[PDB]
Amino acid sequence: AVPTVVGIPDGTAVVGRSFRVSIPTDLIASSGEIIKVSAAGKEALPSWLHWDPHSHILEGLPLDTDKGVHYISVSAARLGANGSHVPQTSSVFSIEVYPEDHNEPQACAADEPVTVLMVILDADLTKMTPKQRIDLLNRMQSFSEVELHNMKLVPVVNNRLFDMSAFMAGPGNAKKVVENGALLSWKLGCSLNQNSVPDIRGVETPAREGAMSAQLGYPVVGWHIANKKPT
Ligand SMILES: [Cl-]
């Protein structure tokens, strides 16, 4: 037998945006071999990533503290008669986490503020696993009508649970805010105003009635729509 070498291409991620890539385990593991996916030189993955061994998906949602380059090892091992894991091969690639998505899914003119809908949640992303972060985005899709990968999810900063610049807004179900808070947002369009915003009853009504929080799994503090400086 002559060993095969598999190269995996490097990836990119953006703070506050879902990350998902397929790992070619069928090329790396000959039949009956055990796959391990970890940070290079460690047993665990970085805190922002999760490995699904049955779908062969590496997925995550980075925070600002995850900015920079993450080396990931994908290795295959033979289980010995004595239960030992005998390493057979390893493939290492990196993922660079960038700081800013500029509220753009990818489309607005550089002359143009982005109209963003934001939902404020009583949650702490730093207390949530990567899978919990992704599941929260998944559960917002019924309300946003935006795909998982086009929503943004970041912590509240400097304890601000409101945006005075918002030209539309409304309440959620929460009466108290126990955690630091999280901001889950998406783009509605470019330099919109109240008359050109789409129908948002599908956000505002479930938010106030508690149906949104019951689906998301976290209390909803409120929602607002504001135009944000282009970047
Ligand atoms: Cl940010």
Side-chain angles (χ1 to χ4, degrees):
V2 161
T4 76
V5 183
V6 178
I8 299 163
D10 292 344
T12 63
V14 177
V15 169
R17 296 293 291 279
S18 62
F19 174 83
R20 178 181 181 90
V21 66
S22 176
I23 300 304
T25 60
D26 294 330
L27 290 167
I28 295 170
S30 308
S31 177
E33 278 171 359
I34 293 163
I35 290 283
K36 183 179 72 72
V37 181
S38 66
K42 312 293 261 164
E43 272 297 321
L45 281 163
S47 66
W48 64 279
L49 289 167
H50 170 71
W51 169 239
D52 186 338
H54 294 116
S55 62
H56 308 330
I57 295 295
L58 178 68
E59 60 189 342
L61 191 292
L63 309 183
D64 66 302
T65 50
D66 303 307
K67 288 181 290 85
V69 179
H70 299 262
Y71 288 83
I72 307 293
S73 165
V74 180
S75 62
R78 174 180 59 83
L79 190 62
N82 71 333
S84 67
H85 293 194
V86 195
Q88 297 298 300
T89 187
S90 193
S91 183
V92 178
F93 65 103
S94 65
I95 305 162
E96 184 162 4
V97 173
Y98 288 96
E100 259 102 45
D101 90 331
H102 309 267
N103 294 306
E104 289 292 1
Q106 300 168 352
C108 280
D111 208 284
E112 225 169 2
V114 182
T115 306
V116 177
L117 198 162
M118 186 170 282
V119 182
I120 307 193
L121 306 174
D122 184 9
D124 190 334
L125 297 174
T126 73
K127 299 180 175 176
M128 289 166 62
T129 65
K131 194 61 185 158
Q132 287 173 324
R133 295 174 195 165
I134 296 294
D135 288 335
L136 174 53
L137 288 166
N138 182 46
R139 289 173 167 275
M140 181 61 87
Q141 290 181 103
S142 306
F143 309 104
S144 65
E145 304 189 343
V146 169
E147 295 203 78
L148 211 150
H149 65 272
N150 284 331
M151 289 178 287
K152 180 185 183 185
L153 179 61
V154 299
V156 164
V157 170
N158 295 320
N159 303 117
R160 202 173 60 220
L161 302 173
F162 52 70
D163 181 336
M164 296 310 292
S165 79
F167 58 91
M168 297 166 70
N173 66 297
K175 293 179 185 315
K176 303 282 157 160
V177 189
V178 176
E179 305 293 338
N180 178 61
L183 311 172
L184 201 174
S185 65
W186 58 93
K187 175 175 175 184
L188 294 185
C190 308
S191 62
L192 305 184
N193 58 47
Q194 187 184 334
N195 290 327
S196 54
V197 159
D199 186 357
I200 48 75
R201 292 173 297 178
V203 172
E204 159 275 326
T205 290
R208 74 173 72 245
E209 292 188 348
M212 179 179 282
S213 60
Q215 175 161 141
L216 299 180
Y218 302 88
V220 176
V221 176
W223 64 274
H224 65 260
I225 299 167
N227 288 348
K228 295 315 194 181
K229 69 175 180 294
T231 58

